[PDB]
Amino acid sequence: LQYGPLAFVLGERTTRKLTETSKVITVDGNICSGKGRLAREIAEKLGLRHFPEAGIHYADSTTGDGKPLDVQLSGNCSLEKFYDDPKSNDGNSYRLQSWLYASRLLQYADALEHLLSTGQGVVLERSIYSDFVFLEAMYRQGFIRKQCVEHYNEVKKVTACEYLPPHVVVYVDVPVPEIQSRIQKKGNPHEMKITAAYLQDIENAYKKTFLPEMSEKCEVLQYSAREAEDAEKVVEDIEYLKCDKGPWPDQDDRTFHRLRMLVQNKLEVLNYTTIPVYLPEITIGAHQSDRVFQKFTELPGRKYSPGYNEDVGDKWIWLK
Amino acid sequence: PTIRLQEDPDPEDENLYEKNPDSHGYDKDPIVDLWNMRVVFFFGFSIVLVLGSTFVAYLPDYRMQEWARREAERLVKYREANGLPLMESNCFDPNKIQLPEDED
Amino acid sequence: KFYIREPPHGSPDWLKVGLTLGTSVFLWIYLIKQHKEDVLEYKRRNGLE
Amino acid sequence: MPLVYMNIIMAFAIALAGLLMYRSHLMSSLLCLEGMMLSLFIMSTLIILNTHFTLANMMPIILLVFAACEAALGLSLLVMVSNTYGTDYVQNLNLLQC
Amino acid sequence: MNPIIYTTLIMTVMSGTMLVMISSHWLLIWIGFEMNLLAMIPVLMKNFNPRATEAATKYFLTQATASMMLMMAIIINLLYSGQWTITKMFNPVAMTMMTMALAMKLGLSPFHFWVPEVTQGISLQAGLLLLTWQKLAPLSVLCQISQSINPNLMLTMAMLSILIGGWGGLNQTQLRKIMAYSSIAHMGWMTAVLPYNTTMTILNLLIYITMTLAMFMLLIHSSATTTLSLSHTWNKMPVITSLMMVTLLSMGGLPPLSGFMPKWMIIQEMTKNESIIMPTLMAMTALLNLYFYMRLAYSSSLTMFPSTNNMKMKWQFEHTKQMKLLPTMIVLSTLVLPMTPALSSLN
Amino acid sequence: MLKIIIPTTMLLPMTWMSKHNMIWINATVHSLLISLISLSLLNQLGENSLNFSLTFFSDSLSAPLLVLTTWLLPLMLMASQSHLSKETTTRKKLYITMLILLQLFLIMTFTATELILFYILFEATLVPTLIIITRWGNQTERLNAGLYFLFYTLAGSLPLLVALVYIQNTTGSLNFLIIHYWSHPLSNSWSNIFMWLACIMAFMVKMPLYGLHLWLPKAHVEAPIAGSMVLAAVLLKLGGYGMMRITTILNPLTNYMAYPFLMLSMWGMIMTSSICLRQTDLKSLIAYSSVSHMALVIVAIMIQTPWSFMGATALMIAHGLTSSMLFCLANTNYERVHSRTMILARGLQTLLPLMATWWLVASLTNLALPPSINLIGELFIITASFSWSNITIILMGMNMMITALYSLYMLITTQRGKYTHHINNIKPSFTRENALMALHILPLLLLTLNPKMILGPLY
Amino acid sequence: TMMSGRPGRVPLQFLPNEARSLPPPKLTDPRLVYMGFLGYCSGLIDNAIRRRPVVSAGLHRQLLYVTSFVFFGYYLLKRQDYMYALRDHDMFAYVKSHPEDFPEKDKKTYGEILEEFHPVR
Numbered sequence A: 001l002q003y004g005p006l007a008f009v010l011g012e013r014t015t016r017k018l019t020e021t022s023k024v025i026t027v028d029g030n031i032c033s034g035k036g037r038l039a040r041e042i043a044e045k046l047g048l049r050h051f052p053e054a055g056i057h058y059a060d061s062t063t064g065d066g067k068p069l070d071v072q073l074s075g076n077c078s079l080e081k082f083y084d085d086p087k088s089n090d091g092n093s094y095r096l097q098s099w100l101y102a103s104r105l106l107q108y109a110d111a112l113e114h115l116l117s118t119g120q121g122v123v124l125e126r127s128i129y130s131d132f133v134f135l136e137a138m139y140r141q142g143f144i145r146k147q148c149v150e151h152y153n154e155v156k157k158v159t160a161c162e163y164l165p166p167h168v169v170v171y172v173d174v175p176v177p178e179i180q181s182r183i184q185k186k187g188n189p190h191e192m193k194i195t196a197a198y199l200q201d202i203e204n205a206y207k208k209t210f211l212p213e214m215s216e217k218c219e220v221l222q223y224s225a226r227e228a229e230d231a232e233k234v235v236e237d238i239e240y241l242k243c244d245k246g247p248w249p250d251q252d253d254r255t256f257h258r259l260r261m262l263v264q265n266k267l268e269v270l271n272y273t274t275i276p277v278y279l280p281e282i283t284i285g286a287h288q289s290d291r292v293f294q295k296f297t298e299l300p301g302r303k304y305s306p307g308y309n310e311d312v313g314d315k316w317i318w319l320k
Numbered sequence B: 001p002t003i004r005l006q007e008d009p010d011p012e013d014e015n016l017y018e019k020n021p022d023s024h025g026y027d028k029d030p031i032v033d034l035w036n037m038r039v040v041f042f043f044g045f046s047i048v049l050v051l052g053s054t055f056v057a058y059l060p061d062y063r064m065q066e067w068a069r070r071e072a073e074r075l076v077k078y079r080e081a082n083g084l085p086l087m088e089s090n091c092f093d094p095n096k097i098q099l100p101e102d103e104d
Numbered sequence C: 001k002f003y004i005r006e007p008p009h010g011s012p013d014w015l016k017v018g019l020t021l022g023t024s025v026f027l028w029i030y031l032i033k034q035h036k037e038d039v040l041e042y043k044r045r046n047g048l049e
Numbered sequence D: 001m002p003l004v005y006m007n008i009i010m011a012f013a014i015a016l017a018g019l020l021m022y023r024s025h026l027m028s029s030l031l032c033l034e035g036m037m038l039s040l041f042i043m044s045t046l047i048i049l050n051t052h053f054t055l056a057n058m059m060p061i062i063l064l065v066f067a068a069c070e071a072a073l074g075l076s077l078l079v080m081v082s083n084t085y086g087t088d089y090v091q092n093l094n095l096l097q098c
Numbered sequence E: 001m002n003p004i005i006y007t008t009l010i011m012t013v014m015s016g017t018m019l020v021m022i023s024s025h026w027l028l029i030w031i032g033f034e035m036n037l038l039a040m041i042p043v044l045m046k047n048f049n050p051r052a053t054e055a056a057t058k059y060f061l062t063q064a065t066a067s068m069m070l071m072m073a074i075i076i077n078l079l080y081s082g083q084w085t086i087t088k089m090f091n092p093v094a095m096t097m098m099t100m101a102l103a104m105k106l107g108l109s110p111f112h113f114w115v116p117e118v119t120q121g122i123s124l125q126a127g128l129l130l131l132t133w134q135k136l137a138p139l140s141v142l143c144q145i146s147q148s149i150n151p152n153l154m155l156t157m158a159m160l161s162i163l164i165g166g167w168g169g170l171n172q173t174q175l176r177k178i179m180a181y182s183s184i185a186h187m188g189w190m191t192a193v194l195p196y197n198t199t200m201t202i203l204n205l206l207i208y209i210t211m212t213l214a215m216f217m218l219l220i221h222s223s224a225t226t227t228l229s230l231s232h233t234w235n236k237m238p239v240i241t242s243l244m245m246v247t248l249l250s251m252g253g254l255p256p257l258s259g260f261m262p263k264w265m266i267i268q269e270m271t272k273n274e275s276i277i278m279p280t281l282m283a284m285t286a287l288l289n290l291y292f293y294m295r296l297a298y299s300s301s302l303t304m305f306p307s308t309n310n311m312k313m314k315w316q317f318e319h320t321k322q323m324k325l326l327p328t329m330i331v332l333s334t335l336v337l338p339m340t341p342a343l344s345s346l347n
Numbered sequence F: 001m002l003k004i005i006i007p008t009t010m011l012l013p014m015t016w017m018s019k020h021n022m023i024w025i026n027a028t029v030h031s032l033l034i035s036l037i038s039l040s041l042l043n044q045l046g047e048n049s050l051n052f053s054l055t056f057f058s059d060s061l062s063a064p065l066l067v068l069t070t071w072l073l074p075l076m077l078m079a080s081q082s083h084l085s086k087e088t089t090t091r092k093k094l095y096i097t098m099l100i101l102l103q104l105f106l107i108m109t110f111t112a113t114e115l116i117l118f119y120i121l122f123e124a125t126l127v128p129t130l131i132i133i134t135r136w137g138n139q140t141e142r143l144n145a146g147l148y149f150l151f152y153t154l155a156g157s158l159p160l161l162v163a164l165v166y167i168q169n170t171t172g173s174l175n176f177l178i179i180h181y182w183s184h185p186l187s188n189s190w191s192n193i194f195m196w197l198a199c200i201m202a203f204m205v206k207m208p209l210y211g212l213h214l215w216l217p218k219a220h221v222e223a224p225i226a227g228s229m230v231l232a233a234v235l236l237k238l239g240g241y242g243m244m245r246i247t248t249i250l251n252p253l254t255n256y257m258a259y260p261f262l263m264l265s266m267w268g269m270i271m272t273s274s275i276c277l278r279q280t281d282l283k284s285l286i287a288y289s290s291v292s293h294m295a296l297v298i299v300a301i302m303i304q305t306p307w308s309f310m311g312a313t314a315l316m317i318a319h320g321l322t323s324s325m326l327f328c329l330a331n332t333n334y335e336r337v338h339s340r341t342m343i344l345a346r347g348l349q350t351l352l353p354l355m356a357t358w359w360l361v362a363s364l365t366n367l368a369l370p371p372s373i374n375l376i377g378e379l380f381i382i383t384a385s386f387s388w389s390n391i392t393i394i395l396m397g398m399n400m401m402i403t404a405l406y407s408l409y410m411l412i413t414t415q416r417g418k419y420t421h422h423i424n425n426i427k428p429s430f431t432r433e434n435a436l437m438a439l440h441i442l443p444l445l446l447l448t449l450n451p452k453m454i455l456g457p458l459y
Numbered sequence G: 001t002m003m004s005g006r007p008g009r010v011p012l013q014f015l016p017n018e019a020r021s022l023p024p025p026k027l028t029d030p031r032l033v034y035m036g037f038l039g040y041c042s043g044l045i046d047n048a049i050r051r052r053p054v055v056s057a058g059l060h061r062q063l064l065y066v067t068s069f070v071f072f073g074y075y076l077l078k079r080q081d082y083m084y085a086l087r088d089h090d091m092f093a094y095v096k097s098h099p100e101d102f103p104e105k106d107k108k109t110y111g112e113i114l115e116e117f118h119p120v121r
């Protein structure tokens, strides 16, 4: 039976599935750090589920089949064009930032839903609470205007206030010159155009605003480049923590019921992302909207409900 | 962005004669266009117009006008021969009408 | 295909289908019987036939 | 009618006006509601006693019970308003307009 | 709020209104009103915020004042006849008290001020409940004592309700305030024909409830509470916009749409007994309601407003919780005009 | 007469169950077949109407209008399948659904035997026309055009409902046969005066009258081609049919009460004919020509003589056909040039000869050339008015002169002269447009061959 | 409300035993057909809202819609006919019971009724 008020009425509660090993874990690191392998190893050792970083086409992997859709139908933005031409006049920068924030919001909703419905913990690679560092980096470098950051702040204020912050935040600290060296050695032709001021603004943002704010609600475990390879040490550090300060031990069954009813129903999660604020970067005209929607509706498995598409081989339609 | 919308450019007119020199101006696909022309012509000019006009031209005289003419001929013949007036002013018999008794 | 279970399965939920079809048939036969009884009572009360 | 009935009705009218005037506070209006109920109770019990209707002697008790329910409701709402604004002033309840 | 507590509060609200509708004693009717208000106050505050708190406060104050006036009317009627049964209510002053108290409970003008504010301050579910279910009990009491009620007082408030509802709805951009002003305008129509024939009142009540239920359920489906927020749903659920446009036309009073049936029947009934001017004024005033419904329809479906980039992500997800009775309410809200003669089953 | 109504309600699901590229063919073919079937109502008894059932009857006045509507739908489908080529399948089906619903309501309107049913369908014709105008228009003024079109009609037709229910409460019935047989004179009182006004003003604003005509230019200019065709051909004749039906109850009040409406109609006919001369737009000129002709029809109905009634019926049919043809002719040029200005594209006779011929024929039939039915109706109305008063001939002759002037002015400006030198996208005329023009114009000549089919019941 | 209070009226019957003396509506009644059509429209709207193939998504659901609408419509029509028959019966009984208020007036022919003539000119 799908979870709802009736499932809550008889039987199913949430606190009887938490086994002290929920521990929503977030790893934050400067561009091109070892946070990915660290998160994977932490998830493997602790037995939690790993959530790879939310990309442009994250929502594509959660619906239909995991195959990503065309950039015109999903995202309408690219990271390569932002690296190559950050000051473009088509508004690609803030469009990309807002789409990535929405994808991170959806991923956080999915992680919370999994944790509440199953009890096994999750290990995210970057949360909605640490997404504003890139926003400040673009704003300080002049990549975006001020109205864009105001719209971002409004959306964040109306969206991120419904969820719970992660139990523990893990930060990987790497100096800017090391980041530049790793970027140069990596090989992708677009990422060597990342200026040093951008990465410096990102890190200034992380230390000054994110970690000081998270230290009031969670536990912060800062590390370094040389101690981010022995994942057994960081796992031992995590499993010897005092989780008594955040709002997580202050949650009753009714609060968990409301949160579980909210994390599912992804439309309710994404409701406030499309507020009627008309910024030139994100506003899309009626004609282009109609054309793109008609194009999306013609996809092989997107015309009807996920069970009523005879195109992708669904049968027994006339009796469902 | 010094603009206000992410708007598609306005498309230019699509000429039906470019990819179809004999278009008939009904559709883009030549076969369905030709058949649309054929059905329009056959059911407008051939069936409805000519057959409908010849059906209307030959409707039976339900308006009772040849009948009215024959009635008039017989009544004129009978009335004139007898010396009676061709037409009578009072449409109804005065005997069957009861006027008010007095007007004072 | 679909990556997720698609709760509407590849076969219909035969329990609900059976319930709906049985409800429809029961309502139809009840309506037929009710109409027959009503017309018989109407014919009896007025003494037509 | 005797003067007692008119005095009770005048008291009810005075309480109703006092409720409808809304000076600054909300406790004042809740007190006006309680006064209206008290006047209704007195009028009802006088009428019932006078006509010797034995059965309706229990009705003013029900009146009092639902008066208490109303008072509890009003007090809870005033508590929440005061927690929101730090003051029970009626001028602060103006977020919604017509 | 716990689901058991919520469902028992809803059942207590329904129990209060049923106690009003099935009781012959005046005291039991007053008790039903009190129970309804007591269990209705927390339902508005299910989603806590300052706006909900002040909406609940205003609603409570208005309903408490109305209950005080109603009980004073009952006591005066008892004073001038030792009778408790809900009947003629011969006494003119007591009848004026009862009529005004029930008008205040209903939202009729000039007591209409509270309705737009409370509707805006509460959620769409609480607004649906308030605008549909909370009209049955006062209307039942009015129908029972309709012969006793004075025509001049009743007519004056109904016409004022229609006028003020139209004029107020002409201005609002928020959907909840539009719905509240439309509710006031419809209350005017229903109480207009009350002294002449209560069957038309019941029929208009049924159709208004159906239309309001359909409109609120469609608004909940496309979770929009403003005009601009509703201007986006053409890019996500065009069928919802088309159905909403048809329902909005029906609400306007246009024929062959069902909404017209209550208006037509009320005009016809009022004409049977030499009331010509009033129906003409009510129709020419309901033109205003039609106008702002039509403006909403222009904003919603008949045109295409610019959308946002993040709607592409909403394109991939389906509405999870589906309303079961929405299609039936839509059909009964639009295509039921040919079944007009079935209104005789209401008397 | 369900043999005509039911095929339309079958046109609906057939349209919705058609293939993506076969909707136009099926709709056109079956609508033409339905019009051929409806051509069978022209057989009318000289004594009384044909009463098929308790709800539907056909008169000599109803049958030409029914045939005109059923013939109109295929032409509207032919004219609409040019600017809708880029539309999706669902919206094309919705457009055809609106057209079919409009035809169904129109068919049920002209044959309803009860006045309240007639009112219900007469007003049900408002929803699809409004949806068409405000959804498939082109400019930003279509919203205001739709609002004007809706509210001018409704604010004048709401009192009609009160008048009708009061009539049924007083006399006891609203069936047209009972109304006509049991009709009684109306005394001279203020109550009866306002009864006259309530019964008349709805159809007056539907004509429209001179003072209440402001909605017509907006609606006819801002609507798409099918909307303009259906507005100017049949939707205007609803008011005339309504007055010709409702006037029986009104006498003897109408003789006394028609002085302001007759005066407005005559002077506004002159005024709108003069307005047509100084028009910079092309569709507005045709709209004002429609206003002038319908004012003439109003005069004919108001003076209320058998010759006036026959002239009114003939003029209604002829104007419907001519105005529809003119609107299509303007729409072809608008599709070529993408503008409505008259003097933009000039000298089109050297580039489109056959369209020049069609323009000439339409303009000739617009200015009442003998022996076309336009002149038959106009001349019968003029003779009836002359019998009414000998001074009306001045106004009628002035109107005829101005009508000829503006018709030939439009024909010369659009067709003669030299081309604009900088419009090089005027492609040769398609077969569809020529076929549409021929299907508009041939019935006019076929009708002037046999004019007794459209002269109404007074024949 | 004229008929709300009537002699010998059971409160919540919805179909008194006296209503069985009237002919039941035929199963092919046009109003029942319209009720079934309303059910079909509701089923189609249900299919459209849930984003399913409108015509052929769920056949059992559409059948249930149609049969429920027809089932309710049968009894609704029965009650409507009963109420109209009851109204006519009461009207005839009242007009018979009070002959002085509904007298039989004289039957004049048009040959002696004088109606004023209004020329059209």
Ligand SMILES: CCCCCCCCCCCCCCCCCC(=O)OC[C@H](COP(=O)([O-])OCC(O)COP(=O)([O-])OC[C@@H](COC(=O)CCCCCCCCCCCCCCCCC)OC(=O)CCCCCCCCCCCCCCCCC)OC(=O)CCCCCCCCCCCCCCCCC
Binding pocket: A297, E238, E239, E242, E243, E245, E246, E256, E257, E301, E302, E334, E335, F009, F013, F016, F017, F090, F091, F094, F097, F101, F104, F127, F128, F131, F135, G041, G044, G045, G048, G052, G053, G054, G055
């Ligand atoms: C009086 C006589 C009868 C007349 C009564 C009235 C008409 C009938 C009753 C009405 C209710 C029935 C159907 C309504 C629900 C359907 C929902 C729908 O959207 O349809 C789409 C659906 C196509 O969807 P699909 O095939 O699944 O794939 C395409 C996707 O859906 C792709 O879809 P999409 O969502 O991507 O497309 C976007 C579109 C989607 O939005 C829509 O499609 C609009 C939905 C219609 C609104 C529903 C209104 C509710 C009913 C009130 C009707 C008012 C009547 C009063 C007159 C005023 C009209 C306003 O939105 C727009 O384009 C926005 C444009 C804005 C235009 C504004 C106009 C909207 C209002 C128009 C209402 C007209 C009346 C309904 C006529 C039928 C329309 C289906 O159409 C159908 O295929 C089913 C239509 C009905 C089938 C009838 C077949 C009957 C049985 C076949 C055999 C016949 C007999 C055989 C036996 C022979 C003996 C051997």
Ligand SMILES: CCCCCCCCCCCCCCCCC[C@@H](O)O[C@H](CO[C@H](O)CCCCCCCCCCCCCCC)COP(=O)(O)OCC[N+](C)(C)C
Binding pocket: B048, B049, B052, B053, B056, B057, B058, B059, F039, F064, F067, F068, F071, F317, F443, F446, F447, F449, F450, F454
């Ligand atoms: C392009 C080249 C052009 C030039 C080449 C032309 C070639 C020669 C053609 C010219 C022919 C000359 C015409 C001579 C007249 C002959 C035909 C005429 O005599 O027939 C008339 C017949 O005319 C028809 O009645 C016309 C009927 C009108 C058709 C209706 C239109 C079709 C419906 C389509 C939709 C229209 C919508 C409009 C709503 C009303 C006479 O009617 P009537 O003398 O009495 O009845 C005779 C039969 N009776 C006596 C037994 C009764």
Ligand SMILES: CCCCCCCCCCCCCCCCC[C@@H](O)O[C@H](CO[C@H](O)CCCCCCCCCCCCCCC)COP(=O)(O)OCC[N+](C)(C)C
Binding pocket: F188, F189, F190, F193, F211, F212, F260
């Ligand atoms: C833009 C165009 C819109 C449409 C226009 C419609 C026009 C409607 C006007 C109605 C025409 C006549 C109405 C009343 C009939 C007689 C009017 C009057 O001139 O007659 C005199 C009446 O005397 C006075 O004039 C009475 C009328 C004075 C008050 C009415 C107001 C008229 C001023 C103009 C108001 C604007 C009207 C249009 C509103 C937009 C004769 O006196 P008497 O024979 O003893 O009484 C006649 C009536 N009886 C017989 C039933 C008793």
Ligand SMILES: CCCCCCCCCCCCCCCCC[C@@H](O)O[C@H](CO[C@H](O)CCCCCCCCCCCCCCC)COP(=O)(O)OCC[N+](C)(C)C
Binding pocket: E202, E203, E206, E207, E210, E332, E336, E339, E340, E342, E343, E345, E346, E347, G001, G004, G010, G011, G012, G013, G014, G076
């Ligand atoms: C506009 C659409 C509205 C539809 C309403 C909902 C339809 C589905 C709901 C199912 C109907 C069942 C409800 C009642 C059935 C059993 C209860 C029965 O005993 O009630 C009795 C009789 O039932 C009801 O009175 C009438 C129910 C019939 C409802 C249909 C009327 C709809 C208006 C006509 C428009 C056509 C609608 C078509 C519907 C699909 C009450 O008699 P009584 O105690 O003496 O009344 C006292 C109060 N009065 C006299 C003042 C009224």
Ligand SMILES: CCCCCCCC/C=C\CCCCCCCC(=O)O[C@H](COC(=O)CCCCCCC/C=C/CCCCCCCC)COP(=O)(O)OCCN
Binding pocket: E274, E275, E276, E277, E280, F152, F153, F155, F156, F159, F162, F163, F166, F191, F192, F194, F195, F197, F198, F201, F205, F212
């Ligand atoms: C595009 C806009 C057009 C607007 C046109 C609107 C004006 C329509 C004309 C008036 C409509 C209302 C008239 C009432 C309908 C008929 C009712 C009737 O016949 O009964 C009359 C009642 O008549 C009235 O009550 C009329 C009252 C009018 C009130 C509203 C007036 C609206 C504006 C007046 C001027 C409009 C007329 C000209 C307008 C021209 C267009 C601008 C007799 O009363 P009884 O009960 O039978 O008693 C008599 C025996 N003792």
Ligand SMILES: Nc1ncnc2c1ncn2[C@@H]1O[C@H](COP(=O)(O)OP(=O)(O)O)[C@@H](O)[C@H]1O
Binding pocket: A030, A031, A032, A033, A035, A036, A053, A079, A096, A097, A100, A101, A131, A134, A135, A191
């Ligand atoms: N909010 C954002 N704005 C712009 N770019 C972002 C944002 N979030 C993530 N990215 C991009 O995602 C890329 C991958 O992140 P990173 O962790 O540095 O590489 P890796 O996947 O190897 O760990 C980065 O190049 C970064 O620029």
